[PDB]
Amino acid sequence: TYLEFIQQNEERDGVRFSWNVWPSSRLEATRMVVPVAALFTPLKERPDLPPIQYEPVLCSRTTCRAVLNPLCQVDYRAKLWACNFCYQRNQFPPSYAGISELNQPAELLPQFSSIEYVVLRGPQMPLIFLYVVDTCMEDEDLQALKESMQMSLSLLPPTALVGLITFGRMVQVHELGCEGISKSYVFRGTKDLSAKQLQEMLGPSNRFLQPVQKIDMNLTDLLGELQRDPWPVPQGKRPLRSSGVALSIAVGLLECTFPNTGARIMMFIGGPATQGPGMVVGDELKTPIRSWHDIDKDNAKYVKKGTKHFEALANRAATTGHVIDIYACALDQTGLLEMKCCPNLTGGYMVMGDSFNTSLFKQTFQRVFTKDMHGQFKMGFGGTLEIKTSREIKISGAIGPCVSLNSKGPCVSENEIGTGGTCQWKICGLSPTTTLAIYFEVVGRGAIQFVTQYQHSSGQRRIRVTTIARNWADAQTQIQNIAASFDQEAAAILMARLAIYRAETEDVLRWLDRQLIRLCQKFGEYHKDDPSSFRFSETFSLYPQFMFHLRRSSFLQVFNNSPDESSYYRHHFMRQDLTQSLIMIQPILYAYSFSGPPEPVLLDSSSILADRILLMDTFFQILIYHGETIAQENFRHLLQAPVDDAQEILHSRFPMPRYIDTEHGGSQARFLLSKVNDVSLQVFMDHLKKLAVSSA
Amino acid sequence: GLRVVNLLQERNMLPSTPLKPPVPNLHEDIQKLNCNPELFRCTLTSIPQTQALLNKAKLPLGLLLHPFKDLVQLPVVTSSTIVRCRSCRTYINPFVSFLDQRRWKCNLCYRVNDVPEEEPHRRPEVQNATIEFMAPSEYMLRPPQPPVYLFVFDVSHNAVETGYLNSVCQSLLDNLDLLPGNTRTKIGFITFDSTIHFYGLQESLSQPQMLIVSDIEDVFIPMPENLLVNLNESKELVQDLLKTLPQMFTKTLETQSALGPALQAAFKLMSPTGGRMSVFQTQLPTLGVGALKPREEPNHRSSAKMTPSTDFYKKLALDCSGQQVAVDLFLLSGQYSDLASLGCISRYSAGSVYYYPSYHHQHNPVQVQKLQKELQRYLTRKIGFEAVMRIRCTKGLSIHTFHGNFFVRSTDLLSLPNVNPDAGYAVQMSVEESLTDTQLVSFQSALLYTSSKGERRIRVHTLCLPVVSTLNDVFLGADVQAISGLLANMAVDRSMTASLSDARDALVNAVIDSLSAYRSSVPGLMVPFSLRLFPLFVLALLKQKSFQTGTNARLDERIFAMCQVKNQPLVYLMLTTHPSLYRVDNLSDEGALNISDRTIPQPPILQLSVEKLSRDGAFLMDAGSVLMLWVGKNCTQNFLSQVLGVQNYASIPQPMTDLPELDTPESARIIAFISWLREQRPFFPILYVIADESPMKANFLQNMIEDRTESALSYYEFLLHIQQQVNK
Amino acid sequence: TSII
Amino acid sequence: MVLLTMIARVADGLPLAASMQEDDLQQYQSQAKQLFRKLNEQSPTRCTLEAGAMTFHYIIEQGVCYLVLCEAAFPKKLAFAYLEDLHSEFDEQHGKKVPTVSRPYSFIEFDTFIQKTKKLYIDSRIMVANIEEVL
Ligand SMILES: [Zn+2]
Ligand SMILES: [Zn+2]
């Protein structure tokens, strides 16, 4: 079963391809209406594979240097193994001299096709957590932020290093535990500083970065005594907030102290940048913050210059290997559009709420420090992803939280998609859910090898090696099996990230149908000029419905949203696996009534019954709608069956979705009526068939 | 006292009793009202009638004033209006001329004024030459500023090694309630090394905040509040910082000091309000603006070849003056620090410098207790803020040169960001128009200041002097000590302006030309009675630290000696230049036993010569700021056991700070005489008995200005050179 | 300036 | 939006208490004294004057005038609310001896209460004239 094939391979290898049977010819290596790509999750969790304490046993062929994998032909009596990417024959290292078929190495069993190695070289490096706190907020918000940061301090490992940077009009770099005076270095929020400058002005451990076990008591008291920015805010003005300078100082600090080691810059802001480089909005309240409508008519003189400042900090932190998180909670916009590249280039988080004093932020913030079965954080640092492909496979590029290392080789394609031109990428921050998208190009069973070297939260260096293989299409029957190996869910998300990438870097809503119509004409069934005869196989049947919700989603219709919300939505889509990505594009809807147990229903106005309860799960919102008749012991169980089921998913999802309890004639019933229903799906499908049976 | 004295025949000219200032030749009722000569005196009590007569006398005409001196009693007038002249705005004084019983003639511009509707001759403004007014609203540029004290500390590695910060913070803790002011008093603190450290003080926080400004080339204020805090409201918060400060920089490796930028930050902190800035520096500034090059110090061999090295601290001082900010400099350096440039911060802001050479908490107990006593006076004496002073004289006389720590605005308005009671000033005058019409001239100084209680007050001193037309009457009224003080101030300016040679030559020629002019208007060296101490006091000027030549003196020593000449009152300039030498091992009952139970001995003053000493006894030297008790190698056993508390000469302690109070009448006599000496002045002078043959305290010897040396003439050799040039 |  | 506060006796314009901090001040402190000289028994007890970009506000209660100057954008309702509690505290334990003092600024120590109250109006966290008539 191709379904069993797709499901079992994502479970084991953390990968899902648009096509599972690949082009066998250069004649039609161009034929792909949807490119050969993969949704790769490098740190995909799975019930307990053995941590392999070897050295990964590399292929001695210079450029190749692939990892020993189950696709390699072995010879246990000649003590040789043949690499599957270049056919050069290797000799087993001394420690493998006593291997046999009765007891073979783990990296050769096909069950261990995705395997993790532990490389203990020398002294581990401690983790680094740098808090960057805004003090221009209300006391309710600032107090709750202080309490949240104090809690996270009690979860950090005893050896981890901690620093504190507070900023208002000025920027303070705090020197912890210094006698009984508690000093700090104050900088103007009106000018930027390089790493070299900051090193000279400030003078393994530091005065500014000290272990938790030796500092937690002093840092807890300091965090609890933080007060708002002492500078008054005149009437009709915003506070002078120097977000861009405080971040460039946090980046510059770690850059000259602990470069090339896992560190997490956690910036907490309660408003937009109003001063200095990176400024987002003016300081007078009468001028509102930029909107999407203000952006296109060119009434936003701060976007281009503000984005350029944070794009430079993003590339600075990503080159050094450090992570930038953005926790923004305010009632107005905050500047995510200008600062998006910092948690996008690095693997940093981006949390967005109305106030730090809500259950929404507090619970979301402590899920950052969720530990596994051994008491260690579910986060990795300094991840280097290298991809080894067969001679006939070339890498066009990657779309996701990563940065190119500008490494060249025979596996690099000439036409680059997203961040291409390399067979190696750096992911400063990654979690078990981090999912990249790699687009390939052909120029059986060719094999693609994923090698991810990262720093574990324990400090150990680790290498995850995933080797996959997909059958070369049989030259006698290709286009029939190629259509059979199509993954409509994976391809839709892979095509979706292509659309968002060029929209976020620009019409995009003219490239989408061209591939949908061409896909209809190639893998569909129809008589010419007969739209009623058009139809799709079960392999492609869900694809147009997937692309219908995509072109109308908030990911591409940026209006009716603020620029910060559009950047926030696009942020989480570029990082999620397939399962959660489908939820974003097409929210799942469950119905609750007396007539039967809970059951999924269609996302159409026809599912809205007066005597029924609906649970719409957008990834960003859990919404419970009460029908008009329902609105007005087991109708309690009808009014809590969604609450119970919503409660379980309202805990697993890292960015805790917003919870809505609305009704017919409710204020927030708008959220249900928008994503439900160029007009409707029926009209969309009929217009599609009239063009697929039409000119080619 | 009309006699003529032969200096070559006397050689014992110095009297045994203290020198009293001359009494001007005025009518008995005019002199009875004259100002106290310690507040205001003149070089020539008989004013020359013409500039030609003044030029013939070859003596300098000028005034020396101590206007803010602490007084026993002060008349404070509260009248609804201040009565001033309608032209030169001269305050009505005891030396005016009433004619129509409601019309008075101004004694400075001769204009008749309406006596305002407020017997007017009984009015206290006409019966007291020194008086203080309550300034009305028109004498205020702004509401009275509060008392603001900002303390700036050097915390480099060299400064930490001196240990000065331990005693300074202790003196502040001891005298925190004694700082002048009311509830409006504000206090602040700044420390620095290569970076500037501000200290915020709030009760809402458990500990003070040390805010580091590291941009040396662009200083700023890191916090809008809580850096200059209210003293009595934040008393406990100020006390905790003063206890913690000497403990923060123990392990400091910072060796460079950025004094300039630190002063720039301190000026910005006080720019809104103004006040007193207390700067404590221990080494040469080497980082940032105001950096000063090192210099190789002179020795006894170097020729006479002092000026500031930069104008930074001079420009910065003028900016402080424009904001009513005064800067007091405490230099506790052990090496060259270019005080010739650093002193500019206090000269042009009406501050004063305090020099403690080679201060160390463990190695120099003399400087340790000297700093303790001087800080006691510095933190407890009265103070006036945002002050100006004007000096008026009778028409025909003109002030042409000002001496002291201030900034001379145009129209000869002396700006004084702070006025302190230990400051002295000098002025040089000339007869611009002949005083033919007048017989009396007057001089009036007015000090407008804001008290530490927030009251605008005006302190006025008025002096009246007669006019003479004969060269003999000019010489008969000469004040030798005042002439010595004015020549010292003129010689200091000559040094910067020209060279130390010209300064030394102008001092010698002042004795030559005056006595040669005297001689040409009458064998040996004949001088009038009023000038018998003139060559002696000038020789004393040429031998002390300011102008001496073949000494091993260091640069910062000479600059500080010149700073004291420009800033001290005349009494302490004379006490320093010509100390008083008494023999104290044989005190008896010829003294001022007048003051109750105490009997205070009054031994005769001895001329400064080793020939006057004796290995059989002990000699105390009053140097003004210090009392050195020399003990001869063969001092009698009575003085050792009954005064020193020691059995033999060998057992006197290496540095002996003070005598013990023992239960002997000999001890009671000497403690009386020393107590009586110290009660005459504000900075308590430390008495050291360590002058001994082997204590390397040959400072005492340096003061015997009459003996010769391998680099200077003796007093006799000086008189012989004077006579040779007089009869040339 | 000043009227002192 | 910045400030200037003066308390004076209406009869002779005698200053009682004030408060100023810079970081001009001269031209606006003079115009303040011009007003204290012109005010008398027939002046309005509550008025607002506007000098150029800045704006004067004052009240008169029991022969004592409470003047404040601020940037014209400062809310007028807050300017008068600031003058009343000043009058409330000043008149409570200084109003008995106001018509007896003779020295200027005989209540400089009211500086402390002024600046404390002053902090609580400049941080957001009746007649109209143009100050040219009376002068
Ligand atoms: Zn190979
Ligand atoms: Zn006159």
Author numbering:
A (entry chain A): 3 to 205, 225 to 464, 475 to 537, 541 to 666, 679 to 723, 746 to 764
B (entry chain B): 347 to 464, 476 to 662, 666 to 882, 888 to 1093
C (entry chain D): 1 to 4
D (entry chain C): 1 to 23, 29 to 130, 148 to 157
Original authors' sentences:
About a half dozen export signals have been identified to date, almost all comprising short peptide motifs, all of them binding to the Sec24 subunit of the COPII inner coat.
(B) Close-up view of the B site on Sec24a with bound ΦC sequence containing the terminal Ile-Ile motif (colored purple) of the S. cerevisiae p24 protein Erv25p. Green contour lines show residual electron density (Fo-Fc synthesis with no phase bias) at 2.6 Å resolution, contoured at 2.6 σ. Thus, specific recognition of the ΦC motif involves the terminal carboxylate group bonding to Arg750 and Arg752 of Sec24a, with the penultimate hydrophobic residue of the motif nestling against Tyr496, and the terminal hydrophobic residue fitting to a pocket of hydrophobic side chains.
